[PDB]
Amino acid sequence: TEQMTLRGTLKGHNGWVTQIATTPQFPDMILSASRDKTIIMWKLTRDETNYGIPQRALRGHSHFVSDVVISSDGQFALSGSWDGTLRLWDLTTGTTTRRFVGHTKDVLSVAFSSDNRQIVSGSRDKTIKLWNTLGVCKYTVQDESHSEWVSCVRFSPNSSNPIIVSCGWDKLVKVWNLANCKLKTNHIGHTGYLNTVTVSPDGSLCASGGKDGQAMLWDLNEGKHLYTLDGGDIINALCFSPNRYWLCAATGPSIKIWDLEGKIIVDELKQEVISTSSKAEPPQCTSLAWSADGQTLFAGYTDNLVRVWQVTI
């Protein structure tokens, strides 16, 4: 079966990498966020000396940047921050065209709609919130929301079932109808708080995880439970492959992949030892992205680096 190998590393940051984002429109570009308050745009290269260079940096947020996402045309990017404000960036000039305001705490995740005509967000303020791209808020979920911090929000990629999924510190996963503005279904099972939720590109399955170290699968349209996978110590991020039936997870200092035909671990990715006089000797992995080609993986870390892996035979 297929096996990963280390390609190279990217060095231009002064705090933990918080997220990475990519598109099929520009395969020599990637974009990433950090606790150093700024978003970096990278020029990738196939040169033997170093795999990429910081090309531009976006500087307008006043605390940490928590989430970042790119428009399907590759012209614009959207981001949230621990300063409680949400911003839309023109990637050609490196300037914000609009600013979104109306949360009263601290913003943990954001997404674009699959048509890119609507925006959604989640926060420590306990409210999910919906926005028009002209910067005006359109609905607020309030009493039916999570009882604790809203950790994540995501859209289904398909057009024929317009719904969103979410996870929170009250250890529930919830599913919501877009046009009707209402809750559809709870899912219950996890013992710890939740860090992440994700959906397969065919629009069929969820995955979710957090402190309990378990990845659990769920149906989007059949409304029911599927099998549980033990990850290890903790789950920081999850993603599906774009062209294989694989789930991938970032788990403490290591990254891991499951082949879902026959439910088996393909490989686990680890770091060369730097001897350290304390517990948690290695730095942890914080975020993942597969390239639009599917053949290469980007991963971010608490040691201010992005590490790149290829597939091999």
Partner: protein, 65 residues
Amino acid sequence: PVNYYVDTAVRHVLLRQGVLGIKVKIMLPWDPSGKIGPKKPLPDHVSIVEPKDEILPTTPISEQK
């Protein structure tokens, strides 16, 4: 905190042998709203909210509206 938790007065009284002094000081109770005392707490009085009503066991289930 002395500027809002302590109430004070000083007075004189004249008796046949001369003047005596009186001084009075009172320390007020904290009153969150009601005007018996100040609404602002003392600077080193931290208080912790109690955890409630959790269930320890779980098993995976789904619940539609």
